[PDB]
mmCIF file of C-alpha atoms in Angstrom:
data_model
loop_
_atom_site.group_PDB
_atom_site.id
_atom_site.type_symbol
_atom_site.label_atom_id
_atom_site.label_comp_id
_atom_site.label_asym_id
_atom_site.label_seq_id
_atom_site.Cartn_x
_atom_site.Cartn_y
_atom_site.Cartn_z
ATOM 1 C CA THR U 16 109.428 99.103 89.590
ATOM 2 C CA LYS U 17 108.271 102.542 90.372
ATOM 3 C CA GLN U 18 105.287 104.710 91.019
ATOM 4 C CA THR U 19 105.748 107.686 88.779
ATOM 5 C CA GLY U 20 103.597 110.420 87.305
ATOM 6 C CA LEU U 21 102.282 113.921 87.517
ATOM 7 C CA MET U 22 100.894 116.036 90.267
ATOM 8 C CA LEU U 23 98.589 118.511 88.621
ATOM 9 C CA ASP U 24 97.370 121.524 90.566
ATOM 10 C CA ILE U 25 93.960 122.236 89.160
ATOM 11 C CA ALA U 26 93.016 124.407 92.150
ATOM 12 C CA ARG U 27 95.194 127.388 91.184
ATOM 13 C CA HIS U 28 94.784 126.918 87.397
ATOM 14 C CA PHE U 29 91.960 124.943 85.705
ATOM 15 C CA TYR U 30 92.497 122.372 82.969
ATOM 16 C CA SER U 31 89.917 121.150 80.480
ATOM 17 C CA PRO U 32 89.053 117.446 80.327
ATOM 18 C CA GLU U 33 90.751 117.359 76.902
ATOM 19 C CA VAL U 34 94.020 118.720 78.296
ATOM 20 C CA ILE U 35 93.829 116.440 81.348
ATOM 21 C CA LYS U 36 93.530 113.511 78.934
ATOM 22 C CA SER U 37 96.644 114.784 77.091
ATOM 23 C CA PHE U 38 98.613 114.768 80.376
ATOM 24 C CA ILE U 39 97.354 111.194 80.860
ATOM 25 C CA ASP U 40 98.674 110.308 77.332
ATOM 26 C CA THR U 41 102.122 111.626 78.229
ATOM 27 C CA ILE U 42 102.170 109.760 81.555
ATOM 28 C CA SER U 43 101.049 106.537 79.850
ATOM 29 C CA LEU U 44 103.300 106.716 76.795
ATOM 30 C CA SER U 45 106.332 107.573 78.954
ATOM 31 C CA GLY U 46 105.706 104.451 81.113
ATOM 32 C CA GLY U 47 104.303 106.276 84.171
ATOM 33 C CA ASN U 48 101.362 105.148 86.235
ATOM 34 C CA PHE U 49 99.673 107.946 88.221
ATOM 35 C CA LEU U 50 98.037 111.343 88.110
ATOM 36 C CA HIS U 51 97.959 113.046 91.552
ATOM 37 C CA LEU U 52 95.097 115.518 91.273
ATOM 38 C CA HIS U 53 95.545 118.546 93.515
ATOM 39 C CA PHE U 54 91.983 119.930 93.046
ATOM 40 C CA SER U 55 91.489 121.660 96.414
ATOM 41 C CA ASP U 56 93.512 124.603 97.828
ATOM 42 C CA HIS U 57 92.960 128.193 98.968
ATOM 43 C CA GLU U 58 91.919 129.557 95.594
ATOM 44 C CA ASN U 59 89.413 126.884 94.516
ATOM 45 C CA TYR U 60 87.780 123.470 95.004
ATOM 46 C CA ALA U 61 87.747 122.315 91.399
ATOM 47 C CA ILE U 62 85.254 119.390 91.311
ATOM 48 C CA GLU U 63 81.570 118.951 91.761
ATOM 49 C CA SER U 64 80.236 118.289 95.286
ATOM 50 C CA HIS U 65 76.895 117.393 96.897
ATOM 51 C CA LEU U 66 78.341 118.018 100.403
ATOM 52 C CA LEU U 67 79.672 121.488 99.542
ATOM 53 C CA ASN U 68 76.679 122.116 97.257
ATOM 54 C CA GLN U 69 78.661 122.981 94.095
ATOM 55 C CA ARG U 70 76.459 121.483 91.478
ATOM 56 C CA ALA U 71 76.636 121.436 87.657
ATOM 57 C CA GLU U 72 72.962 122.255 87.448
ATOM 58 C CA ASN U 73 73.626 125.493 89.515
ATOM 59 C CA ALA U 74 76.558 126.536 87.330
ATOM 60 C CA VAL U 75 76.989 128.721 84.226
ATOM 61 C CA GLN U 76 78.546 126.571 81.482
ATOM 62 C CA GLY U 77 80.966 128.267 79.084
ATOM 63 C CA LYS U 78 81.200 127.583 75.363
ATOM 64 C CA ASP U 79 84.209 125.433 76.214
ATOM 65 C CA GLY U 80 81.939 123.112 78.265
ATOM 66 C CA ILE U 81 83.515 124.307 81.545
ATOM 67 C CA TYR U 82 81.133 124.827 84.522
ATOM 68 C CA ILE U 83 81.551 128.031 86.558
ATOM 69 C CA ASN U 84 80.199 128.277 90.093
ATOM 70 C CA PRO U 85 78.313 131.581 89.883
ATOM 71 C CA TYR U 86 78.934 132.369 93.602
ATOM 72 C CA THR U 87 82.662 131.787 93.648
ATOM 73 C CA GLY U 88 83.144 132.656 90.015
ATOM 74 C CA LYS U 89 85.519 129.635 89.711
ATOM 75 C CA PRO U 90 85.477 126.493 87.510
ATOM 76 C CA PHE U 91 84.821 122.910 88.499
ATOM 77 C CA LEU U 92 84.714 119.516 86.818
ATOM 78 C CA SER U 93 81.280 118.011 86.664
ATOM 79 C CA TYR U 94 80.714 114.413 87.738
ATOM 80 C CA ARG U 95 80.084 113.477 84.056
ATOM 81 C CA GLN U 96 83.353 115.117 83.099
ATOM 82 C CA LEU U 97 85.155 113.282 85.898
ATOM 83 C CA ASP U 98 83.588 109.968 84.804
ATOM 84 C CA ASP U 99 84.905 110.625 81.275
ATOM 85 C CA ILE U 100 88.451 111.322 82.701
ATOM 86 C CA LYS U 101 88.236 108.232 84.974
ATOM 87 C CA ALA U 102 87.351 105.907 82.074
ATOM 88 C CA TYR U 103 90.161 107.356 79.974
ATOM 89 C CA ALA U 104 92.750 107.006 82.827
ATOM 90 C CA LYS U 105 91.695 103.508 83.627
ATOM 91 C CA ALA U 106 92.049 102.351 80.010
ATOM 92 C CA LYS U 107 95.525 103.901 79.965
ATOM 93 C CA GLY U 108 96.533 102.205 83.207
ATOM 94 C CA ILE U 109 96.866 105.562 84.997
ATOM 95 C CA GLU U 110 95.829 105.650 88.630
ATOM 96 C CA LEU U 111 94.055 108.829 89.805
ATOM 97 C CA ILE U 112 95.149 109.973 93.242
ATOM 98 C CA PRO U 113 92.828 112.656 94.638
ATOM 99 C CA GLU U 114 94.304 115.151 97.133
ATOM 100 C CA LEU U 115 92.007 116.718 99.672
ATOM 101 C CA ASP U 116 94.510 118.964 101.399
ATOM 102 C CA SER U 117 94.261 119.762 105.124
ATOM 103 C CA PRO U 118 94.615 121.141 107.727
ATOM 104 C CA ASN U 119 95.823 124.186 105.746
ATOM 105 C CA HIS U 120 95.444 124.829 101.959
ATOM 106 C CA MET U 121 91.631 124.523 102.236
ATOM 107 C CA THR U 122 90.138 128.002 102.038
ATOM 108 C CA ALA U 123 87.957 127.189 99.017
ATOM 109 C CA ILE U 124 86.262 124.438 101.059
ATOM 110 C CA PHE U 125 85.697 126.938 103.919
ATOM 111 C CA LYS U 126 84.146 129.418 101.520
ATOM 112 C CA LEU U 127 81.696 126.789 100.098
ATOM 113 C CA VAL U 128 80.787 125.595 103.617
ATOM 114 C CA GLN U 129 80.179 129.181 104.712
ATOM 115 C CA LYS U 130 77.816 129.828 101.771
ATOM 116 C CA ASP U 131 75.882 126.590 102.128
ATOM 117 C CA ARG U 132 75.873 125.914 105.873
ATOM 118 C CA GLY U 133 76.572 129.459 107.190
ATOM 119 C CA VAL U 134 79.380 131.278 108.956
ATOM 120 C CA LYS U 135 78.671 130.029 112.517
ATOM 121 C CA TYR U 136 78.828 126.432 111.304
ATOM 122 C CA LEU U 137 82.159 127.080 109.510
ATOM 123 C CA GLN U 138 83.721 128.892 112.517
ATOM 124 C CA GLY U 139 82.881 125.854 114.673
ATOM 125 C CA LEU U 140 85.036 123.565 112.533
ATOM 126 C CA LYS U 141 88.027 125.899 112.427
ATOM 127 C CA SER U 142 91.014 126.092 114.722
ATOM 128 C CA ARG U 143 90.361 128.810 117.337
ATOM 129 C CA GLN U 144 94.064 129.624 117.159
ATOM 130 C CA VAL U 145 94.675 129.952 113.404
ATOM 131 C CA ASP U 146 91.957 131.096 111.018
ATOM 132 C CA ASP U 147 93.305 129.255 107.944
ATOM 133 C CA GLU U 148 93.063 125.710 109.315
ATOM 134 C CA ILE U 149 90.529 123.093 110.277
ATOM 135 C CA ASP U 150 90.601 122.184 113.978
ATOM 136 C CA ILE U 151 92.491 118.873 113.977
ATOM 137 C CA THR U 152 91.557 118.353 117.668
ATOM 138 C CA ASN U 153 87.792 118.686 117.158
ATOM 139 C CA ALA U 154 85.975 115.355 116.651
ATOM 140 C CA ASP U 155 83.312 117.227 114.671
ATOM 141 C CA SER U 156 85.977 118.609 112.371
ATOM 142 C CA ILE U 157 87.321 115.114 111.822
ATOM 143 C CA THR U 158 83.812 113.795 111.128
ATOM 144 C CA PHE U 159 83.262 116.620 108.612
ATOM 145 C CA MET U 160 86.593 115.924 106.850
ATOM 146 C CA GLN U 161 85.772 112.265 106.673
ATOM 147 C CA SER U 162 82.289 112.939 105.195
ATOM 148 C CA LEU U 163 83.986 114.958 102.362
ATOM 149 C CA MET U 164 86.657 112.263 101.964
ATOM 150 C CA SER U 165 83.852 109.684 101.512
ATOM 151 C CA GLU U 166 82.323 111.768 98.721
ATOM 152 C CA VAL U 167 85.729 112.195 96.988
ATOM 153 C CA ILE U 168 86.311 108.446 97.297
ATOM 154 C CA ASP U 169 82.893 107.769 95.735
ATOM 155 C CA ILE U 170 83.643 110.175 92.850
ATOM 156 C CA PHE U 171 87.026 108.596 91.894
ATOM 157 C CA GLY U 172 85.856 105.045 92.707
ATOM 158 C CA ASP U 173 88.085 102.172 91.427
ATOM 159 C CA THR U 174 90.429 104.490 89.459
ATOM 160 C CA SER U 175 92.138 105.228 92.785
ATOM 161 C CA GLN U 176 94.125 102.997 95.149
ATOM 162 C CA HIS U 177 95.638 105.867 97.125
ATOM 163 C CA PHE U 178 94.153 109.025 98.612
ATOM 164 C CA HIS U 179 96.360 112.001 99.373
ATOM 165 C CA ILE U 180 95.555 113.701 102.685
ATOM 166 C CA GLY U 181 97.804 116.692 102.109
ATOM 167 C CA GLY U 182 99.552 117.807 105.283
ATOM 168 C CA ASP U 183 101.743 120.593 103.860
ATOM 169 C CA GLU U 184 102.625 123.959 105.327
ATOM 170 C CA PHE U 185 100.379 123.812 108.383
ATOM 171 C CA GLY U 186 100.901 125.207 111.902
ATOM 172 C CA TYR U 187 103.587 127.692 110.930
ATOM 173 C CA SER U 188 102.715 130.204 113.731
ATOM 174 C CA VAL U 189 101.750 127.543 116.282
ATOM 175 C CA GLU U 190 102.741 124.343 118.105
ATOM 176 C CA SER U 191 100.377 121.715 116.677
ATOM 177 C CA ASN U 192 102.542 118.732 115.751
ATOM 178 C CA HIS U 193 101.514 116.161 118.345
ATOM 179 C CA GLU U 194 97.830 116.474 117.482
ATOM 180 C CA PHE U 195 98.724 116.205 113.793
ATOM 181 C CA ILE U 196 99.980 112.621 114.357
ATOM 182 C CA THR U 197 96.643 111.770 115.871
ATOM 183 C CA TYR U 198 94.712 113.500 113.072
ATOM 184 C CA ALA U 199 96.748 111.982 110.214
ATOM 185 C CA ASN U 200 96.579 108.529 111.809
ATOM 186 C CA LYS U 201 92.769 108.800 112.116
ATOM 187 C CA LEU U 202 92.529 109.742 108.448
ATOM 188 C CA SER U 203 94.810 106.855 107.377
ATOM 189 C CA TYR U 204 92.827 104.173 109.272
ATOM 190 C CA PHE U 205 89.528 105.585 107.913
ATOM 191 C CA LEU U 206 91.007 105.255 104.385
ATOM 192 C CA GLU U 207 92.344 101.765 105.181
ATOM 193 C CA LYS U 208 88.817 100.644 106.069
ATOM 194 C CA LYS U 209 87.684 102.052 102.687
ATOM 195 C CA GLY U 210 90.333 99.871 100.955
ATOM 196 C CA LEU U 211 92.609 102.843 100.248
ATOM 197 C CA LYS U 212 96.239 103.598 101.029
ATOM 198 C CA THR U 213 97.236 107.043 102.259
ATOM 199 C CA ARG U 214 99.625 109.520 100.672
ATOM 200 C CA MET U 215 100.896 112.520 102.615
ATOM 201 C CA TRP U 216 103.321 115.471 102.264
ATOM 202 C CA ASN U 217 106.466 115.175 104.508
ATOM 203 C CA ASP U 218 106.104 118.477 106.348
ATOM 204 C CA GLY U 219 104.750 117.073 109.638
ATOM 205 C CA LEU U 220 107.302 114.300 109.914
ATOM 206 C CA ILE U 221 109.621 115.323 112.713
ATOM 207 C CA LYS U 222 112.143 113.337 114.775
ATOM 208 C CA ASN U 223 110.210 113.828 118.042
ATOM 209 C CA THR U 224 107.021 112.155 116.833
ATOM 210 C CA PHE U 225 107.324 110.441 113.418
ATOM 211 C CA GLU U 226 107.646 106.977 114.889
ATOM 212 C CA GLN U 227 103.982 107.372 116.079
ATOM 213 C CA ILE U 228 102.741 107.680 112.456
ATOM 214 C CA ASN U 229 101.029 104.736 110.785
ATOM 215 C CA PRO U 230 103.973 103.171 109.036
ATOM 216 C CA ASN U 231 101.782 102.332 106.042
ATOM 217 C CA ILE U 232 101.235 106.022 105.196
ATOM 218 C CA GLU U 233 103.141 106.753 102.003
ATOM 219 C CA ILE U 234 105.192 109.929 101.857
ATOM 220 C CA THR U 235 105.436 112.480 99.018
ATOM 221 C CA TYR U 236 108.750 114.122 100.009
ATOM 222 C CA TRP U 237 109.121 117.566 98.474
ATOM 223 C CA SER U 238 111.556 119.512 100.661
ATOM 224 C CA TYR U 239 113.578 119.095 103.874
ATOM 225 C CA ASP U 240 112.675 122.631 104.932
ATOM 226 C CA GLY U 241 109.618 123.833 103.084
ATOM 227 C CA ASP U 242 111.855 125.777 100.745
ATOM 228 C CA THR U 243 112.063 128.568 103.318
ATOM 229 C CA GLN U 244 114.154 131.547 102.220
ATOM 230 C CA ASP U 245 115.013 132.218 105.926
ATOM 231 C CA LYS U 246 118.319 130.391 106.625
ATOM 232 C CA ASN U 247 117.789 130.181 110.407
ATOM 233 C CA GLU U 248 114.375 128.616 109.748
ATOM 234 C CA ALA U 249 115.951 126.241 107.172
ATOM 235 C CA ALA U 250 118.522 125.184 109.841
ATOM 236 C CA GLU U 251 115.836 124.584 112.553
ATOM 237 C CA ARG U 252 113.668 122.547 110.177
ATOM 238 C CA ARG U 253 116.612 120.426 109.037
ATOM 239 C CA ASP U 254 117.464 119.641 112.654
ATOM 240 C CA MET U 255 113.886 118.935 113.624
ATOM 241 C CA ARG U 256 112.390 117.255 110.570
ATOM 242 C CA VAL U 257 113.075 113.731 109.355
ATOM 243 C CA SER U 258 115.233 113.368 106.178
ATOM 244 C CA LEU U 259 114.213 111.188 103.272
ATOM 245 C CA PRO U 260 116.941 108.644 104.138
ATOM 246 C CA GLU U 261 115.749 108.575 107.754
ATOM 247 C CA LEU U 262 112.276 107.666 106.514
ATOM 248 C CA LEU U 263 113.686 104.954 104.227
ATOM 249 C CA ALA U 264 115.673 103.531 107.141
ATOM 250 C CA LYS U 265 112.430 103.217 109.117
ATOM 251 C CA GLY U 266 110.687 101.350 106.289
ATOM 252 C CA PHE U 267 108.461 104.073 104.837
ATOM 253 C CA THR U 268 107.276 104.151 101.297
ATOM 254 C CA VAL U 269 108.617 107.445 100.030
ATOM 255 C CA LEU U 270 108.204 109.146 96.628
ATOM 256 C CA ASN U 271 110.639 111.848 95.704
ATOM 257 C CA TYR U 272 108.908 115.103 94.802
ATOM 258 C CA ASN U 273 112.180 117.200 95.117
ATOM 259 C CA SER U 274 110.945 120.759 94.552
ATOM 260 C CA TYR U 275 114.230 121.947 93.040
ATOM 261 C CA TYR U 276 114.084 119.620 89.980
ATOM 262 C CA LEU U 277 110.512 118.407 90.050
ATOM 263 C CA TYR U 278 108.366 121.499 90.718
ATOM 264 C CA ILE U 279 107.469 123.763 87.845
ATOM 265 C CA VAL U 280 105.430 126.952 88.329
ATOM 266 C CA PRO U 281 104.352 128.071 84.888
ATOM 267 C CA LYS U 282 104.249 131.780 84.271
ATOM 268 C CA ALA U 283 103.645 133.538 80.962
ATOM 269 C CA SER U 284 106.744 135.482 79.856
ATOM 270 C CA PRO U 285 108.936 135.953 76.779
ATOM 271 C CA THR U 286 111.066 132.913 77.874
ATOM 272 C CA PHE U 287 108.415 130.484 79.216
ATOM 273 C CA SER U 288 108.718 127.942 76.450
ATOM 274 C CA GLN U 289 112.587 128.084 76.393
ATOM 275 C CA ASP U 290 112.811 127.830 80.208
ATOM 276 C CA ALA U 291 110.454 124.818 80.249
ATOM 277 C CA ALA U 292 112.556 123.174 77.509
ATOM 278 C CA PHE U 293 115.704 123.838 79.492
ATOM 279 C CA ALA U 294 114.128 122.383 82.658
ATOM 280 C CA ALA U 295 113.696 119.068 80.886
ATOM 281 C CA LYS U 296 117.341 119.001 79.740
ATOM 282 C CA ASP U 297 118.446 120.011 83.254
ATOM 283 C CA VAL U 298 116.588 117.046 84.802
ATOM 284 C CA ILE U 299 118.041 114.718 82.170
ATOM 285 C CA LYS U 300 121.638 115.931 82.748
ATOM 286 C CA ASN U 301 121.603 116.596 86.495
ATOM 287 C CA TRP U 302 118.701 114.852 88.270
ATOM 288 C CA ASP U 303 118.438 111.264 89.432
ATOM 289 C CA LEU U 304 115.988 109.509 91.701
ATOM 290 C CA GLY U 305 118.394 109.597 94.692
ATOM 291 C CA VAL U 306 118.791 113.312 94.626
ATOM 292 C CA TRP U 307 116.100 114.391 97.126
ATOM 293 C CA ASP U 308 117.462 117.427 99.006
ATOM 294 C CA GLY U 309 116.881 120.229 96.488
ATOM 295 C CA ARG U 310 120.039 120.560 94.372
ATOM 296 C CA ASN U 311 122.201 119.090 97.164
ATOM 297 C CA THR U 312 124.118 115.941 96.170
ATOM 298 C CA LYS U 313 126.027 115.247 99.434
ATOM 299 C CA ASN U 314 123.162 113.344 101.117
ATOM 300 C CA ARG U 315 121.923 111.633 97.978
ATOM 301 C CA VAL U 316 120.609 108.107 98.087
ATOM 302 C CA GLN U 317 122.907 105.634 96.289
ATOM 303 C CA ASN U 318 120.568 102.692 96.927
ATOM 304 C CA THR U 319 117.655 104.091 94.840
ATOM 305 C CA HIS U 320 115.816 100.668 94.819
ATOM 306 C CA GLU U 321 114.359 101.808 98.177
ATOM 307 C CA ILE U 322 112.763 104.962 96.750
ATOM 308 C CA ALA U 323 109.247 104.071 95.660
ATOM 309 C CA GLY U 324 108.987 106.647 92.804
ATOM 310 C CA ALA U 325 108.740 110.347 91.885
ATOM 311 C CA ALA U 326 106.506 112.939 90.316
ATOM 312 C CA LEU U 327 106.668 116.162 88.402
ATOM 313 C CA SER U 328 104.486 118.771 90.096
ATOM 314 C CA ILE U 329 102.952 121.559 87.977
ATOM 315 C CA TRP U 330 101.797 124.280 90.287
ATOM 316 C CA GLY U 331 99.257 126.866 89.210
ATOM 317 C CA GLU U 332 99.859 130.080 91.244
ATOM 318 C CA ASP U 333 101.544 132.102 88.545
ATOM 319 C CA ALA U 334 99.841 130.695 85.434
ATOM 320 C CA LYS U 335 96.942 133.178 85.065
ATOM 321 C CA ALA U 336 97.964 134.424 81.601
ATOM 322 C CA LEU U 337 98.635 130.929 80.239
ATOM 323 C CA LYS U 338 96.181 128.523 78.696
ATOM 324 C CA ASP U 339 95.871 124.978 79.945
ATOM 325 C CA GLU U 340 96.929 123.577 76.547
ATOM 326 C CA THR U 341 100.041 125.859 76.400
ATOM 327 C CA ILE U 342 101.067 124.572 79.824
ATOM 328 C CA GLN U 343 100.537 120.976 78.805
ATOM 329 C CA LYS U 344 102.433 121.228 75.486
ATOM 330 C CA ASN U 345 105.383 123.058 77.065
ATOM 331 C CA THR U 346 105.802 120.712 80.077
ATOM 332 C CA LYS U 347 105.655 117.504 78.033
ATOM 333 C CA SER U 348 109.421 117.152 77.603
ATOM 334 C CA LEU U 349 109.947 117.710 81.324
ATOM 335 C CA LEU U 350 107.269 115.238 82.357
ATOM 336 C CA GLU U 351 108.743 112.614 80.012
ATOM 337 C CA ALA U 352 112.233 113.224 81.454
ATOM 338 C CA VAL U 353 111.101 112.863 85.081
ATOM 339 C CA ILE U 354 109.266 109.584 84.289
ATOM 340 C CA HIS U 355 112.140 108.159 82.266
ATOM 341 C CA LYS U 356 114.814 109.227 84.789
ATOM 342 C CA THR U 357 112.768 107.683 87.583
ATOM 343 C CA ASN U 358 112.116 104.377 85.810
ATOM 344 C CA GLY U 359 115.624 104.365 84.222
#
């Protein structure tokens, strides 16, 4: 009995409350149970915030009801809008899982902090070594993160039993892994005290250190190797990182986010709608819950009872010329397929 749903990247491409509710309808009617809301990344922080001072009252509202931060020029969901989505989700039995990504994938947060609190403040929270990451070793940085987590927790309230702490694609130019264990553990126990379970991307789970991780942290496992196109890098990561079966063997809750079958990156083109349709059929024909390592079937899990669930991820990077509703209508078949194939 599985945890299954949608990860929706609203940081790279914005979606109206109406369209978000349509995604919820699909999840619900297909027998799924969560919406993982990826609202914070480099390009935007897509919800209202007291702490980052992104307020509906400060915004320009479009005819479509969508609030635009006049400094960043980017959209965000108001608290009233989020309360409307929360009520709708809750009545449909769909859990909302917020994702506040760190230590990387957080430039929009930096940019809001800089504007409101100033550049010297912001630089003090950053890694001295890499300019695109929070300093996971700085107590003050941890305190700051936790203050924003508290706000996000307050916003989603009882619609959420899990909070996603991100943890993807960080430290690529540096050695930072040991301190990541410490950082992620601190975040998980802070959430635990708030009555929340932790979700996290698999990227930082390596053989050398993974046994130090809070074994209650729940893993969203997307790729063995970060989908690197460099084959020497792919080989190092596969030797260093933990596999999905290795995690299962240690007792972890793991959801299969397999980027080969379960990531879609919508892009307007003459074949977008056909391609999306085909993706659904491809998952139906060729994907099953035990297939975790991209398209590779040699290491598949035969005992799928151990795999906690799966999600379709709709990523926003390439979707600039597409409307939210076009994306939603065209990915419906694929989202249904992933949910049904996961639940059986």
